[PDB]
Amino acid sequence: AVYRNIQACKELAQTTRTAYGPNGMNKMVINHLEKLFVTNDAATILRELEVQHPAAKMIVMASHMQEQEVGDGTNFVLVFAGALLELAEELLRIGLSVSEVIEGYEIACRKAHEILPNLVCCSAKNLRDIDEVSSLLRTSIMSKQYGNEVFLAKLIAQACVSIFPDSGHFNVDNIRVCKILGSGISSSSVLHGMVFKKETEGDVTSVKDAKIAVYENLMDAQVKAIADTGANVVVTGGKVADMALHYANKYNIMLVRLNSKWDLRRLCKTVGATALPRLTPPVLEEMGHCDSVYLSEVGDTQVVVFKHEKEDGAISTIVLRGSTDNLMDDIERAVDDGVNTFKVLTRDKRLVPGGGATEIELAKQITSYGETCPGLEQYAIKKFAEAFEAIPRALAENSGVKANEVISKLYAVHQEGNKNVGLDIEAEVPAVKDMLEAGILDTYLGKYWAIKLATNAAVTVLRVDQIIMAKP
Amino acid sequence: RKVQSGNINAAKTIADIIRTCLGPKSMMKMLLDPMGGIVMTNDGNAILREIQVQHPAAKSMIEISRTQDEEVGDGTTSVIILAGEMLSVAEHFLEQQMHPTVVISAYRKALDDMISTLKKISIPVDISDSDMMLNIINSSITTKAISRWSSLACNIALDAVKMVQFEENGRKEIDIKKYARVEKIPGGIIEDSCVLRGVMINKDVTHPRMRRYIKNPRIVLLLQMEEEYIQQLCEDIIQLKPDVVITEKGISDLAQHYLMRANITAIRRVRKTDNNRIARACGARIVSRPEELREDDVGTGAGLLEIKKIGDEYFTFITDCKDPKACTILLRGASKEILSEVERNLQDAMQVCRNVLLDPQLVPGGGASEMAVAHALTEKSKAMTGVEQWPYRAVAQALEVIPRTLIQNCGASTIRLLTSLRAKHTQENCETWGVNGETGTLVDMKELGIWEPLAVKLQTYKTAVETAVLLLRIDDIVSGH
Amino acid sequence: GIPQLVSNISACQVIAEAVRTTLGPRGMDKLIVDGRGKATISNDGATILKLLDVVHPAAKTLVDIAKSQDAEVGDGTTSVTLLAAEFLKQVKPYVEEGLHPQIIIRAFRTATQLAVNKIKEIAVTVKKADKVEQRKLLEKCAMTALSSKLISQQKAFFAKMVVDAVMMLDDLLQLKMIGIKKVQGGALEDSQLVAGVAFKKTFSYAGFEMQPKKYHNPKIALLNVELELKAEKDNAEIRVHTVEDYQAIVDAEWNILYDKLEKIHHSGAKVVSSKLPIGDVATQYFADRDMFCAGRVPEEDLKRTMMACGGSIQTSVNALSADVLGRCQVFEETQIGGERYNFFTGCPKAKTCTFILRGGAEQFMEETERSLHDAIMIVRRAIKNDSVVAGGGAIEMELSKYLRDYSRTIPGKQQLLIGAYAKALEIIPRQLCDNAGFDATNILNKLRARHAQGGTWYGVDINNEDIADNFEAFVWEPAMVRINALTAASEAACLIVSVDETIKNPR
Amino acid sequence: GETIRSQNVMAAASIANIVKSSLGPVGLDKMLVDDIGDVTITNDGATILKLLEVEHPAAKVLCELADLQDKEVGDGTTSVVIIAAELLKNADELVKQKIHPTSVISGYRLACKEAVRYINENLIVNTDELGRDCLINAAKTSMSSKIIGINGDFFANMVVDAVLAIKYTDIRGQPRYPVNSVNILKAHGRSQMESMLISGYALNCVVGSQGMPKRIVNAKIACLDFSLQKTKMKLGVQVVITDPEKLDQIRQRESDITKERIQKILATGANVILTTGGIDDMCLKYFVEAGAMAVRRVLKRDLKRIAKASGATILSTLANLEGEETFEAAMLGQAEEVVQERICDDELILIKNTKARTSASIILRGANDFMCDEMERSLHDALCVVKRVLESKSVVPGGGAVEAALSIYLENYATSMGSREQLAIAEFARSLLVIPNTLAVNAAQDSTDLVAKLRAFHNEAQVNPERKNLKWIGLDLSNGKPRDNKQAGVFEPTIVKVKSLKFATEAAITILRIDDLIKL
Ligand SMILES: Nc1ncnc2c1ncn2[C@@H]1O[C@H](COP(=O)(O)OP(=O)(O)O)[C@@H](O)[C@H]1O
Ligand SMILES: Nc1ncnc2c1ncn2[C@@H]1O[C@H](COP(=O)(O)OP(=O)(O)O)[C@@H](O)[C@H]1O
């Protein structure tokens, strides 16, 4: 049952072969809750596309490992794996054993880890400059929200530069996302601290209280119990009563309404104020710690900002604007993709050119190694190089250009020693261009973990030859 | 593209039939006749000849093979396999969305490189040495009944083509149909067979009054009113006093009354090709009619005239001590089955001498010639600027099927030896490290007699690629007349 | 891949086919019945798609674009629908021929910006052109909308009412603010114009010879109390056997109504309005203290009064005070056709008004109700944007020559795609030829050739079966709204061609 | 009805798809299945439709369409069917758009008038023979697919002078060229660059005996088909001889007749004697004494060209029904010099400055016959290309240049007429784009890009007449890029595209007028 598992994994490649690259197609996703969505991120397709074939579930579980130590290259796991098994049939139909292919890819997986550092063209200067981030971040945002790479490359650059001085503390949790219904990308901006969309329900515009609480004459004494405990900021989960709204304004207690539960639990882990279920009990232990709680009006919309003036501050929140909730979700993923791009660059910085440049340069070397390396494993090392070529083919098809002219021209420039050459991103131009001058640079550490996972997944599939049901 | 793909499966299935019918360990096949009978042959030439096929693309494979049988009596099995394997790479036709013209230019470009690569591993031959030619012709004598008289078949096959070759004209043309007429004579055994150094006519003896044995013959090539011309056309021939009257058309019954009166041999139904060999043998001349004969139409220089009944059958021996651009084989045998074995097996060996004498160049067979070629095109593809390099590499991977079948028919591990066979051509010289057809392991061809001529492989790869070009140039089937 | 896109091409055309015969003022009507069996007949394209509730996924893409065209403009959403569908129709044979769908998105994004550059370069500013007062220019553009109708003979009278309704409002214009009443009887020239808010005033109960209809600065009370005696809201009945207890019971029934009525006098209400009816017994208490009482007011008319007088509508009577009582300057009653009509003119927040039509038939007011909504928006968008272009599908014929002539110099795959974008814009005037019963063959073949001869504003004449300079005929449409529609249709088509495979969660 | 319109369009449309992919010189082959089962393979569009048997009435209308194109032009009939197919396919959509065929027919007839006039307004006369090159470039580009293309300039120059040698008008300023082209010879010159051009006919024969001089300056050339050897009455009827003594009489008497023939033949003074059947050995001796240049067993087809060269009469037999005469002053031509040159392994007989020959000969000297054979087909085919162009009194640049230029003019002309015929002329010109759109697929290039490049340059030709605009841009398939035919030399005649669009527009009208099908 090997040919059936391979053919089943090729069914999954076509669901993400076209969604890859800047000219990639979108996919008409329909949620399980009877909702319509349109996107091109491969991570979101598999979350809704229930992959029931067990043979391809290993590839999806490999993409789950793509979350740890990296936040990019998911399409590499889906395309590179599908091309290895697709060409694996050409070896098995000749008569080659499945075991010699398994040990052949482990040889090429190590060989590529030794050739990849030689192709590192440049590295991040780590000067914490906005022009440094936005210039290098031009690669990761595109193919996720294409055309709007100008504003996004500069916004996230402002959020990451604020955290690098706090060395050893940069993570994706520091840069949160907060989107508001608005006109479009022109009104989007970046602010410090925690920023939410719901404005202050009460009359307080600014209060420097420390304790924050999260949840006719009787209710007037209960709101006073929040003040008796030394807290002038009350956060109600659901709706607030009309009588309780005014009682908070008498003692200058800032009323805040947070309907989304993600807004409530976000405060539990930052200032320490946890949500109590009872109707405002006088519990001081479960209250938080904040330096200043004030109201800000940015983008013609009032927003509650929790700025930690006394502390150093490491909590960033990008204020996004967009008229469509479906479109703002596509921007939500590109923001998380850009934040995770530099989260890997906190380690040793190494950058490789994208756009199929390294994939031909890496295949040109392994192919030459397979010609001079005798043994029964060379057939698998050769196709491991030709499997890299499918990633240029993914971009050539999405760009509307014949992939045959792409692989010929990428091989010709590298044959003459012209490295750092990738695909020209244009439909009317089947030629190529230099990736170094264009500013297209991927992450070295992402490819090291991506080629490692895609080979282990393809080996994990080839090791299986039959599926048998069971019962505990 | 449905018509482009139809010619793939139409030829891929035909190659599957004769895929295991290659080499000295060729596998037999079972053909069910409509009358319940079974033929258990193994030659791919006769197998596909009787199998009726429905697709037109597969029918062209049969018309191509028959023309190959006239040029060279062997190697036609690989002609269809390479043309079928070259077209079996559907990744570059449809999946890559390439045009057929893209791949045709790639194969035509690879054709000129394969021709030069086979000449690099060539080797000259000293045709003067009969022992060096014995190693070449023995490739066909092995696994035959003629192995008991291999030295006799070598003398019959090698010396016969030397008589047909005329090296004074420059072109050195060799024709087996006109100048190498093979005939049988009853009686005797395979040992009694020899090559007649002249012409032999298969005309039976009708009248008893005919010159039986003459050491210096004389050959003449060419109621009331009815017998007027008959007696006069016959009386003009005896002016020269001949001993055998050789006529082109048939002779009447009354004209033979004067041929038996003269007690001379009467021969008729002789082709125009047959009389020229005689005119060049005994120096005679072909006259249009019997009435305008001259002195030059004589048999001066002839060996002898013998119409003896050998094996209960007359045979007119008009041989001489010269080689007038022609020859005649005398096959002797006790039965027709034994005669049928030597007659057909010598035609396989006689055609090998035709390829060496026209161009004394050999190639290392037994899977050695393919790997020597496929290794040259693979390295050349890495430096070939253009999209044609991808189908250029498919030819390097497709020609490996010839040694794949020889090792698979033997039953050994084809995947283990073929992968290591690449290393022998990668490091060491490509002219050696072949594959043993009987044993299955690797061995050098300089020590073995698996060397094939040059003309056999040239027509193979030319026709193997030309067949794929003609089939990929098709894109639709037209019905009508 | 390829076939999923063709399924979306046809899945969107049926949506365009649902509103294909609604383009233009003289479009066709439909009949969409809901689950309750209610009849809804309207020629507006936006209202058709709101009630269809198409569950197809690729169809809802254009529904979201049409709703955005309605939220911002409120008109012309059909033109976004037919154009978005035709971009998919002309590229249909090119999709199956092996051309990539992403290449088409670059073509529409290329041709869309090329149209805005040509629209802004060709649009003409009209503020005080030809030395004409703007009242005449707004009357000229408005009267052309009313021609070829039942009121064609007295259109000059009705043409002057619209310019008075807009100038009475502030700089902020809104089509919903100007209400239109329908009253059967009388001629066409007897249609009146009220600058304030008015209602039918079906109150025919007692209160005669009192309740003066004039007030200086009256306090308009907005209640929802039924002051009837035998009311379903107020009542009193206690079943007992004692006889003397019944006298106190009948006194308690009159006290429930009367005690609530004293709150109306103590609150300071001078003109008391109530949605529920008021009985003849309660009208006399208002008549004894010299108070104006007029009920049976619809709830919709009070919402226009709440925006006009500046008060608030209270359900309870105990909450009646100076906080909710509005004010006005001129409150007077008229006798339009003999029926009573109260109205408040000269309010502080007089953003709304009222317009009562007249005629001897109910259907003549229906066609007049539709034409007035078209004449107001022309005056609304003429002052908003003085840079406008010719109407009647004229602007669509300009781009057909420019984008085509521009595509003839753009080598590559963008040629036939931007060139097909030109032929795709011919759907707007072709429907005006069919939706008006004209021959689209003679018009488009004569109209497209007029532009090469020197035409720059010639368009489809909806009145006569011929070509006419719609700019000289004062048939204008905004230049920016045409750009907002083309940008909306290009975004609508590019989202469909960007899709190549449908993914559905199994549920 | 309309259902009959749709079924008749697909019938004629599918006929074009049979010869669609086979368009151009890089056309794909196709299998022709006859009634028996044989398979004839070819890419020629004309031969496909002659054997194509499709039982449908609308398809047989396209057969008669090809017959007039075969007699009028004799080439390019494959393009006549594809243009007509697109008009019906485009006209089919108009019928669905509530358009009548009469409005479409009335528009197509006018569109054909402006097409012929626009071509005539952008013609180029027959010129550039000497002093300007589209001559060297005309032949050098055509012979690229053969081995001869190594040194194209050396082999292309010999084609220029060959066309001018075969130039004779003879009718009111006709200028055309004959069917008999330059007879191409070959030999072993140890290299391909040794090809020598001879401005004169070359006979590949030898005189035999070396004693005869190889320098004959006598203008009289004796041309005969009668053999001077033993003359037989008939090869089917032999003279009966009842005596061997009588045989020697006729034997010796025949040699006595040649003693009278040898004197009467040489009585004309012609030293160049050519015999078809052969010359007797005793008769060759008398020519060594008198010094005449005799050749035996000359090919009759080669002698027919020599008789046409010097103007000699082909003498069938010396017996003029009463005796035996030599036809003095009838079989004699006029030449200046006949010298048997010493070429490699072949003493060729060169003839120069005859009465009127208008021909030449090319000695394709090479290393082996494998190259000389491939070189002979390249020049023989390259001659027909330049011969076809410089005969047509006026020519036009072809190769996608004519059809792409009409796409803009006839589309702009449609914006001036109107009158319910704009869509017909709009789609008539759009249908002509299929010719380059089809040739791009056969050239293994992107079909949508190359057609747009032609119209990108052809539109600028009409926007302004400035020299910056790229004008007369054809489409070369050997490179897959537009090229200027003025520089490349890709020219076509005038009457071809005229008659091609003429019948293609007329045949589509004939099928468009068919609304119902009545059978019996
Ligand atoms: N501008 C671009 N040009 C070429 N390739 C790109 C570009 N942007 C992204 N890609 C490629 O598409 C694949 C997916 O990119 P990305 O969205 O950054 O990662 P993921 O899909 O895993 O989130 C990556 O391998 C990347 O190289
Ligand atoms: N002794 C041998 N050892 C190895 N290979 C052989 C031997 N004899 C023949 N072959 C291989 O078998 C193939 C077919 O040979 P042959 O039978 O002569 O032609 P065909 O199979 O077409 O009749 C040849 O290509 C040759 O390489």
Numbering used by the authors:
A (entry chain Q): 28 to 242, 273 to 529
B (entry chain g): 20 to 241, 268 to 526
C (entry chain H): 18 to 524
D (entry chain a): 14 to 533
Question: Which statements did the authors publish about this structure?
Answer:
The eukaryotic chaperonin TRiC/CCT assists the folding of about 10% of cytosolic proteins through an ATP-driven conformational cycle, and the essential cytoskeleton protein tubulin is the obligate substrate of TRiC. It has a double-ring structure, and each ring consists of eight paralogous subunits (denoted as CCT1–CCT8) arranged in a specific order. Each TRiC subunit consists of three domains: the substrate-recognition apical domain (A domain) and the ATP-binding equatorial domain (E domain) linked by the intermediate domain (I domain). Here, we present an ensemble of cryo-EM structures of endogenous human TRiC throughout its ATPase cycle, with three of them revealing endogenously engaged tubulin in different folding stages.
We denoted this map as TRiC-tubulin-S1, which was also in the NPP state with consecutive CCT3/6/8 subunits loaded with nucleotides in both rings, indicating that TRiC can engage with the substrate in the NPP state. The TRiC conformation in the S1 map resembled that of our TRiC-NPP structure, so we made the same subunit assignment and built the atomic model. Overall, substrate density appeared to locate right above the central N-/C-terminal tail density of TRiC, and associate with the E domain of every TRiC subunit, mainly with the C-terminus and stem loop of each of these subunits. In TRiC-tubulin-S1, nascent tubulin could potentially become stabilized by its engagement with TRiC, leading it to overcome the first energy barrier to reach a lower level in the energy landscape.
